[PDB]
Design a protein around this ligand. Structure first.
Ligand code: NA
Length: 412
């Protein structure tokens, strides 16, 4: 039942133990719990939110313990809310950890905390709701702001319910046939004006799936929207918070004719095929496949309408999900972004590194847009999406293709 002795951070370090931040990831990432309050987690703290526990089976927890290298008798020091700390203690006890304490001086020295360099780009429901009601909040939009739901095709679930004051974007407004690449600068200019977006409008996007919203977001960043943000974990986090919803067709938007800069203002954020091919086989650059493992080895193309199978030869595997519509390797059990530390280590093992020119691709770019926005928020400075992805690559039977099981070395 009970906790071992309380440890300070210093003692925990001396004893080669680990700290476990048991708050929701939003706060682990950098969001203050009160205005002006401590921002981020203790050095090398892990994040195991108590709110995830009901969606972690016994084996998911065991896996997570192993994966963070918690040795069974090495000290673990927990911090956060009491109920949360206690829920995690119970679970870790049942999983067989033997030295569980509280981190006594947790969050007591703000100057030593670590944060997602741009945590403010991944918002959470309560922040968004506070902003809407006119409450002073951390990282407040500098000027106008808009909330937009992004999904494939005309409004459906949006008609049933959506975040109050949210506009709606059909992803067909930003990408189109033949390659499912983004539409033209000129079509983008009109799309932006129509939804009342200028270069200095803060745009907060969410979707029923994070990647639809991310796709829109990366495209707006390319175009020239300076401040584009995602709801971390998407719509489901809003629904689950039991916050207010509105209903019915999207209300009329007041057009903004003049964007205020020439589009595109950030063209380096999107690569074509030749540019993508240029990144291969380099220490200072990575072309990253955000495709499932069966796509990566050539069991399946991932899509009904893509006949060719295999992968871009020399693409480094950035992980993804179980299939072409899932992103488990980037998600906590509640659907929010896994920790920066974990993502950084997963990518590192494949020689994908923040000092490189790094471009993400997948089938047609949605999954890659998602990892792009994470990497942006992790503070990766040279990131982009290779729009065409496997669909464009495998159009040309001259492009080199890899199949078969292979590891990190095989993409030098
Ligand atoms: Na594409």
């Amino acid at each position: 039942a009970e906790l071992a002795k309380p440890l300070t951070l210093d003692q925990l370090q001396q004893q080669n133990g680990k700290a476990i931040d048991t708050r929701p990831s939003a706060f682990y990432n950098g969001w203050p719990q009160t205005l002006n309050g401590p921002s981020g987690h203790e050095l090398a703290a892990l994040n195991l939110s108590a709110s995830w526990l009901d969606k972690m089976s016994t084996e998911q927890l065991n896996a997570w313990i192993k994966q963070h290298n918690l040795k069974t008798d090495a000290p673990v020091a927990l911090y956060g809310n009491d109920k949360d700390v206690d829920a995690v203690k119970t679970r870790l006890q049942k999983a067989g950890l033997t030295h569980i304490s509280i981190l006594s001086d947790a969050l007591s020295e703000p100057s030593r905390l670590q944060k997602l360099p741009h945590f403010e780009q991944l918002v959470y429901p309560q922040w968004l709701h506070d902003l809407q009601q006119g409450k002073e909040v951390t990282a407040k939009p500098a000027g106008d702001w808009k909330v937009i739901e992004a999904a494939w095709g005309a409004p459906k679930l949006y008609l049933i319910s959506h975040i109050p004051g949210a506009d709606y974007i059909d992803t067909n407004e930003v990408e189109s046939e033949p390659l499912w690449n983004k539409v033209s600068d000129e079509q983008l200019k009109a799309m932006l004006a129509k939804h009342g977006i200028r270069h200095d409008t803060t745009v907060i996007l969410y979707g029923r799936d994070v990647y639809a919203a991310a796709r829109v977001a990366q495209i707006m960043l390319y175009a020239g929207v300076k401040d584009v943000r995602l709801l971390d974990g998407g719509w489901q986090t809003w629904s689950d918070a039991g916050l207010p919803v509105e209903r019915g067709t999207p209300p009329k938007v007041k057009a903004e004719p003049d964007f205020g800069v020439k589009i595109p203002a950030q063209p380096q954020l999107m690569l074509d095929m030749e540019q993508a091919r240029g990144l291969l086989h380099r220490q200072d650059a990575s072309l990253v496949s955000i495709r499932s493992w069966p796509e990566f080895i050539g069991t399946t193309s991932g899509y009904s309408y893509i006949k060719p199978k295999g992968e871009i030869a020399g693409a480094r595997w950035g992980h993804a999900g179980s299939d072409s519509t899932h992103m488990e390797d980037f998600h906590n059990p509640d659907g929010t972004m896994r920790s920066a530390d974990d993502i950084t280590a997963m990518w590192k093992a494949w020689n994908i590194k923040p000092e490189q020119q790094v471009s993400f691709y997948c089938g047609t770019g949605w999954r890659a847009s998602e990892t792009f926005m994470y990497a942006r928020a992790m503070g990766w400075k040279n990131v982009s999406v290779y729009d065409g992805g496997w669909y464009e690559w495998s159009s040309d039977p001259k492009n080199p293709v890899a199949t078969g099981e292979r590891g990190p070395d095989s993409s030098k």
